[PDB]
Amino acid sequence: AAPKAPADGLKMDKTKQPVVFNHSTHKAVKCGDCHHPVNGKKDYQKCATAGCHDNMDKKDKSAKGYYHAMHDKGTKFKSCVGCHLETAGADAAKKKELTGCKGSKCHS
Ligand code: HEC
Ligand code: HEC
Ligand code: HEC
Ligand code: HEC
Numbered sequence: 001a002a003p004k005a006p007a008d009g010l011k012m013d014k015t016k017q018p019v020v021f022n023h024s025t026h027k028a029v030k031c032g033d034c035h036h037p038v039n040g041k042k043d044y045q046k047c048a049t050a051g052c053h054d055n056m057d058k059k060d061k062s063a064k065g066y067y068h069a070m071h072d073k074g075t076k077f078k079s080c081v082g083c084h085l086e087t088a089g090a091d092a093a094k095k096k097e098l099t100g101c102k103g104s105k106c107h108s
Helices: 066-073 080-088 092-099
Strands: 010-012 020-021
Touching: 066 080, 080 092
Parallel strands: none
Antiparallel strands: 010 020
């Protein structure tokens, strides 16, 4: 069938700063804006699959840079932090919760 959203509490732990991803709080976002087209087909593999966002150099800005794909603005698909910046706006509490580098819902 079509793929279904997994349960909440999925740990992204390619790095030393792992982050929990909950589908239940992202239902306002289409599946394909994250599980984005690759060669025109939505791809539901893990983001850091080899040949995907598998460069663990957090300084890399190419599409393969994992850090880059999770944190930067101006990306072809919204990143976690990019979309959250737009969502938080001028609301300082939401900026901390959604975009803070520490003491946020991504990074404790
Ligand atoms: C403020 C601008 C932030 C700073 C600085 C960093 N983060 Fe994040 N972050 C997010 C994800 C999805 C990951 C990957 C989790 C995993 O698979 O382990 C990370 C990872 C990091 C790391 C580790 C990089 C390395 O390779 O060691 C650093 C240094 C880091 N981040 C700093 C997600 C999020 C997120 C959710 C929306 C927010 C608000 C932030 N990150 C914020 C920052
Ligand atoms: C971005 C905000 C997303 C939206 C919208 C949806 N998903 Fe998602 N999903 C996302 C992440 C960051 C993760 C973890 C990937 C990681 O690399 O571990 C996932 C994972 C899943 C999975 C499991 C994939 C795997 O481990 O094999 C699937 C099947 C899944 N997601 C499905 C899916 C559906 C069908 C969506 C729409 C209803 C959907 N996702 C939305 C990020 C995001
Ligand atoms: C491999 C099959 C992939 C998987 C699984 C995911 N991504 Fe991806 N991503 C991939 C390619 C080949 C590219 C470039 C496509 C092209 O048109 O240039 C991207 C692009 C991104 C971007 C934009 C990066 C930029 O503009 O520099 C982001 C933000 C991104 N991808 C995020 C993302 C996430 C969150 C994923 C897991 C849910 C994910 N991608 C999977 C290849 C692959
Ligand atoms: C927009 C296109 C989004 C993308 C890409 C990602 N997120 Fe998100 N997120 C978004 C919304 C609209 C909301 C709700 C905001 C509110 O005020 O609560 C969120 C929420 C979060 C949260 C907090 C809720 C929770 O699940 O505990 C976290 C921790 C979260 N989002 C993480 C996250 C990650 C790790 C992403 C990239 C893989 C990601 N978000 C993408 C919208 C959007």
